[PDB]
Scaffold this active site. Structure first.
Site, PDB file in Angstrom:
ATOM      1  N   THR A 229      49.977 -43.765   9.100  1.00 22.70           N
ATOM      2  CA  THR A 229      48.776 -43.977   8.303  1.00 22.70           C
ATOM      3  C   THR A 229      49.085 -44.774   7.046  1.00 22.70           C
ATOM      4  OG1 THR A 229      47.604 -42.047   9.136  1.00 22.70           O
ATOM      5  CG2 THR A 229      47.037 -42.806   6.927  1.00 22.70           C
ATOM      6  N   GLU A 266      47.158 -52.346  21.088  1.00 24.75           N
ATOM      7  CA  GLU A 266      47.521 -52.177  22.498  1.00 24.75           C
ATOM      8  C   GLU A 266      47.262 -50.712  22.821  1.00 24.75           C
ATOM      9  OE1 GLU A 266      48.606 -54.372  24.732  1.00 24.75           O
ATOM     10  OE2 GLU A 266      49.261 -56.131  23.598  1.00 24.75           O
ATOM     11  N   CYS A 300      51.015 -47.346  30.482  1.00 26.32           N
ATOM     12  CA  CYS A 300      49.682 -47.762  30.083  1.00 26.32           C
ATOM     13  C   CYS A 300      48.938 -48.372  31.264  1.00 26.32           C
ATOM     14  CB  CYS A 300      49.758 -48.753  28.933  1.00 26.32           C
ATOM     15  SG  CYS A 300      50.939 -50.098  29.193  1.00 26.32           S
TER      16      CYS A 300
END
Ligand SMILES: [Cl-]
Ligand SMILES: [Cl-]
Ligand SMILES: [Cl-]
Ligand SMILES: [Cl-]
Lengths: 509, 509, 509, 509
Positions: A229, A266, A300
């Site tokens: 973050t 991605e 993925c």
């Protein structure tokens, strides 16, 4: 009890790993944050420990990387390419032990761990060529005595956040390209593959050091959501490349957009294979199996939806059943094992909840669906039939080996069913129809970033740009002109003439 | 009392304009929303009225545009290029009346209104060529018996939101490129230039209807922030091209990111001109005067910061003062007028507010600073000296003709002062030093999207890609490979072989 | 007697043609050479006369064109594009009358005469887009402080020699590309289409003259072999683009190579269609017919060899034979006509000679083979079966509508039979087999410059490069990066640093 | 008495060389032609012998290479790239000893012999990247249901004829590119550098044999003009890359054109440096010296003409003379040596004739001009002033270190004098003037293939295309899109629709 303290695993020392490792590298090694222990998912035994980055570690490292950029950006791109070539050579020298660590800490089988390092090697060698090629056109200006040129320059510091399942090659593909483009990099890997992150960084660090270059060009700050973050919100991170879940990537993309940063996203996939009536079933069946169960369904690009024409659906499912029965299960280092464990126990709980939801949503488990009775995070590779294509669990990315099988009749509807989900990464059709193949590749065909014919959803190579559309996030890595995401374009007009502007009645002296 | 009902403005009818105009087009004309009156900034007189889009209008128009896309996407790109060519010709046939309307409704001088239409004409002919060229590479696959191709396909509906200050050419540049790329478009122009939007849409609609195409391929929904916000939140808008303020564009960017849409942001500028000691001052002085006061300081690419080397600072400032005094002010359509009004009464208040704020921040007004005592929204072009480079008002985009003049001594500090603002649109240096020129174009040089040498900050042509970095938003329009923003890339692997996958020990049938 | 003096041909005067026309244009119209009268092949009547170039005319024209180049090369490419855009519009204005002159003097049917002018119009619009795009990359230098750029510049004078069968579009494609690349042109068309060359040159000359440009930018020197040989030997002709017979082009290419000039060779074809057993026969039969008999078999891309799988050979021959019997023959300007005359009486004689030679080599005429009993140069479209694929007449290009039909069995032999001839222009397979298609397009497939699938040998558009391999000459025209043949590449290193070379032990002052 | 039989030269064994070496390689090593002895040009001592190719050896080798092509062209280009990558590593392993052989047999100094091997290594690494990039565009067809693609395929066998002066790098650059493009190669190097050709071929042959590839993929037929002529006449040599004199190259280019082969000609140079009045003379003088005398004046890019503005002419000559006198002459392997021998005694004789002739044409030898009294082929580096720019001897390439110096006044005349010679390889200006620089690079500037600014005539790097214009032959090697010269373009239209052609009134089935 640490695996690295057993003589059985002394090979880990060839990667410079110890019982407790430094998870921060910026030229020097450190780490004042929490100490994390990573575990082998095949047996839930602890491997070794990594001290993660504190906030102060992160601040120091960002500052050092950006100072190092002032040196690095001044080095001609071909000479930056030479550094990347040497990184490629350094990986080759360690490919067996690095591959073994990927298998140990991440859980994929050894050939896939080795092959992932090989992919990093291959993209280094590609990027070496690119380092003599990147740039833009000189264009013909409409103004007499002016030049018009398209320049490309590094964006600066590229943050790279990566997922557990490709803990080497995603960073490597981002790193190799970002480097020849003149950027410095800051890596925060998945916390559960921290040892891989350290090991790769040790390999690169040695090449930088041997070439008298500041190591912060490839900095590392191991951490979790806290460090990630910080990168998403940090104006000093000029490009944030994020590989991970859609849920997290959505929030990162927002935080970057809020500061007018650049992001390369991605994210998740829900990839479909479609077998038409004319498909070679001797090609479909093995293609679907390996695409569905490879890496225990944790790519993925894993095949998660299988659309089969009505006239062949039963035969394909039966043949897929007889094939799944022969999937060889073991520890990911065991020779000739096709199938290892899931990465965490939480992925197992996600697997079970999905099988349960599917069964209660009307699906039938024709194969698998159960946890295996053995140590580690092993689940059976699963096939589910009878679900509707719009079933909620089939529209969700469950990162486990569950293949939902659907019937269809017509081309237009099954193309729409491919496209109807929120993810848009990979897609495959199996057919011999020339017209259908080119419609699939056209504007009314697949909406995914990877659009394959007679090869399943994991069919990709480094020569092409890699990435997805829609909720997969739009980013591209590796081949084609993906390098342009790591640089800033400028459109430059150069007046080399002595011509003065028209006075427009004004009297200038 | 409408200007359109007065004999001097009869030419407005040649654009198809009337006292009250329909501001929604989608194949049919309509508009059930609020009726807006637009005013001539030269005299504050009302011109005509435009019925804006209701929510129902917007909904119906988006649906019709996407239905038309099914037809439009099936038309081969060179034949779409032929349509854009005809649009170019339809513009030519109306360039004088259209440019006159730009001057009338927006307020820039006639040659710039006419020039803006010519720019749209020029991009059309560019796009005609591009319509036979767009595509990607066929790449060499590492796999025997496989092809590897990069395909490009339309994203679908391109929503286009534009600013008041280039009310024809920004939309046109987006339109021509999106059209040849296979997209349908939906335009929401600035409300204060609604008649221009209607006029342009009438020209395009005739071309579409004449070619028996559905008019919704180029749809129009006039409105303000309510319609713009709808477009930003609407998943059916596949790409949102936004040209406007950074403040609005940041919220548009976040709304689009929220839904994993695509955005093309063309936002604020704060462009610097830098004159080094070796500069040709007979080039510097006219270039700065024109870039600073052209379009009454209301170009995105307007020169708003002027850095002058300390050795020549006073001479250039005094030559500028003497040149500013000769600027010919008047009605924008009158011959020889170089300086017309600001677009709104509101902008005049912004102008005075900035002039007062700069005086508080230590700046000295060496020319102008006041409102002109005449009808319309006329203010004096203004020169301010004595501010620090980091004064807050100088870091802010005030869309008014105020030029902040700074001294500098050395190249490194003044390059950083160029890059220190949040905007990153255009930039210019004036110098003869060959090395300085190539450092300015290099990685330690300007961080802007437009990086010019010996031409001011409005130096740009359609052959190159147009846009900015940092808070300017990152989008590109017009030339180079800007077209790729209006399309989706796919990386496509085609197995044309009969080779089967490696069985990996499994006994397939 | 002269057709142009008869009332029903008064439309010729719309092209500016008289009873006797000047065949030399260099800004002035002249022609001290031989006067030629050209004939209409549909009725063997004289049309009008052209005074061709003398040697003095040729000398004076080369000098004026190269002087004009000094002005033309200084015009920015985009503005050169604007001239080419205006040529396209000027051609649009006369398309019907020009296409009718092509039909009258050359003999092709009206839709093909008009379509030829349309193709010139289309390449003009393509070149307009190219005029803002031509150039080379800026490349990353390995040397610090240096730029590395690839520049492209015009070669100078581009000589263009063209054939009778495409007397407008071959010139036009060369002209439009050469012009936007900054070259001047010198045209010598086929002597039997001199009126077409004059009419095209009158259209271009007006555009140049209207734009206050020297007419020698697009020069014309009508003449025969002597003028063509002069251009081939002339050092002042920097690039010679030659379209014609392999026999003449071989000598042209040797003469240009002898003087280290540049040549662009577009020579003969002997183009094959191959129909495999799985081909769509309702596609094969009409594709073969129109590709074999279009333009009375007088296209460079005409189908002259038809290979048919043994299984379908008799059916396809029988269906062609039934379709050939319905070909409508007549005056090429009548719109019901598909089939016009051959260009000359010698062409009719060589048709008969080839038919006779095919019979002597063992072939059977299954349709046609004879001259038509009507005025003009009309022969029957002809099909010959039974020859071996290596029959001498089958390996000869005969510019007449004779289709030689062969049987084959397997893919490898029939690819080899496609490739065995000396010509390498166009080729086509008809098949549904995905693997066969990509093998045909790959390294063991067709050796030709145009390689088509399920479209015949005449499938070509302006967007790609057009030309052949082997004895077809290797030149390319029109699309892709064919423009590079009209320019000279330079690789340019710019040292912009203050760094000095290493002294290497030598004390420099 | 052979150097290889003396113990101080045992290092030559590290290259696999011995007393008598086979000079043919095609998978097997052989040689039935004449046995050539090569001599060290620094002392005229014999080194070793090579058995050259007879015509039978040539015939067998071409046949075996074309057989090997059937396997090689089927290997995916990225995998051919991996082979070239391994060649680069094998060269790295031998770079010092191979560089030392280059100095011993050819006579250039050691840093340049090693530097030549390094250049080959770099082009290999470049070619590895290119092996995943080569190809052409997918283009938008104007026809519905059709694809339009540009395919690139290998031409087949690429013959490579190379000159004595870059006996490693010219071949290596041709070999690396041709190999990744799918071609097999046949090398005939200069007879006087036969040992180098054998040594390089031994390095490549081991890589091919270790990869179980047919060795004829990189074939070697050592010989002289007999073998070279056979290659130029041989239809089986699909592309002939020739590097050598213009005199021989012209005849090669004519023989290749006669058979409609492809040639890539890299011929002679007559390269000028131009120093303008504003040049940095501390940059001009060392740039001129090293570019004139490097490699004893035996680079194709050697500076042979030096034009100096008349204001600085005498100063530069005087300073150049003082620097020439410091040039360190000796054995080229001696690390402290800058200047070695010419390659042959015939080169010395040609040097003397040119010096004699410059005097007869009115020139003055102001430095050097004599053969040196010592073993080997040493001549003094020479400076000649006072010749007219168009003196015949100054328009001749004498492959020797003679620098003709000329005065000039204005830019236009000296640009013309650069361009007036028949050669067109490299050119350089030294100036600070921005406008002069961009004029030099534009249409009225240098006509050469290499056009440099503030770096002398030998300034080139592998990233760019390398070659010249006019009598330099027009070919390009190495970078940019030079790879296209080793392949054949096809323009391919693929009809994937079920649409039939329009019947045009004919009743088909
Ligand atoms: Cl002034
Ligand atoms: Cl099976
Ligand atoms: Cl000196
Ligand atoms: Cl039929």
């Amino acid at each position: 009890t640490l695996l690295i303290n057993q003589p059985q695993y002394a090979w880990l020392k060839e990667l410079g790993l110890r019982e407790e490792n430094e998870g921060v590298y910026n030229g020097s090694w450190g780490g004042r944050g929490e100490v994390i222990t990573t575990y082998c998912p095949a047996n839930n035994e602890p491997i070794a420990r990594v001290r993660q980055a504190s906030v102060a570690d992160y601040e120091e490292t960002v500052k050092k990387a950006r100072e190092a950029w002032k040196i690095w950006a001044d080095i001609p791109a071909p000479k930056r390419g030479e550094i990347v070539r040497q990184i490629g050579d350094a990986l080759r020298e360690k490919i067996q032990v690095l591959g073994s660590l990927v298998s140990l800490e991440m859980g994929k089988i050894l050939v896939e761990g080795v092959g992932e390092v090989q992919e990093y090697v291959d993209i280094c060698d590609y990027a070496v060529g690119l380092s003599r090629m990147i740039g833009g056109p000189i264009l013909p200006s409409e103004r007499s005595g002016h030049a018009l040129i398209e320049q490309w320059n590094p964006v600066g510091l590229v943050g790279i956040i990566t997922a557990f399942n490709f803990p080497v090659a995603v960073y490597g593909g981002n790193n190799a390209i970002a480097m020849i483009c003149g950027n410095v990099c800051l890596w925060k890997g998945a916390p559960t593959t921290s040892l891989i992150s350290v090991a790769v960084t040790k390999i690169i660090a040695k090449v930088l050091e041997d070439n008298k270059l500041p190591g912060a060009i490839c900095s590392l700050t191991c951490g979790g959501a806290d460090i990630g973050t910080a990168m998403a919100k940090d104006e000093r991170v000029n490009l944030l490349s994020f590989t991970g879940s859609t849920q997290v990537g959505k929030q990162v993309g927002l935080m970057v957009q809020e500061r007018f940063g650049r992001s390369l996203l991605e994210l998740g996939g829900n990839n479909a294979i479609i077998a038409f009536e004319d498909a070679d079933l001797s090609l479909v069946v093995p293609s679907a199996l390996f695409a569905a169960v490879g890496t225990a369904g944790q790519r993925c690009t894993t095949a998660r939806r299988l659309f089969i024409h009505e006239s062949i659906h039963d035969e394909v499912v039966n043949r897929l059943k007889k094939a799944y029965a022969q999937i060889r299960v073991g520890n990911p280092w065991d020779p000739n094992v096709l199938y290892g464990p899931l990465h965490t126990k939480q992925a197992v709980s996600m697997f079970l909840g999905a099988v349960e939801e599917a069964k209660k949503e009307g699906g039938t488990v024709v194969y698998g669906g159960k946890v295996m009775d053995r140590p580690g995070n092993y689940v059976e590779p699963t096939i589910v039939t009878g679900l509707g294509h719009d079933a909620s669990i089939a529209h969700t990315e469950t990162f486990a080996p569950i293949l939902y099988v659907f019937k269809f009749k017509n081309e237009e509807e099954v193309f729409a069913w491919n496209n109807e989900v929120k993810q848009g990464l990979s897609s495959s059709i199996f057919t011999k129809d020339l017209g259908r193949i080119f419609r699939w590749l056209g504007p009314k065909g697949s909406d995914c970033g990877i659009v394959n014919v007679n090869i399943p959803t994991s069919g990709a190579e480094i020569g092409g740009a890699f990435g997805g559309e829609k909720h997969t996030g739009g980013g591209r890595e590796s081949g084609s002109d993906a390098w342009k995401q790591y640089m800033r374009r400028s459109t430059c007009t150069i007046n080399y003439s002595k011509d003065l502007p028209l006075a427009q009645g004004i009297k200038f002296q």
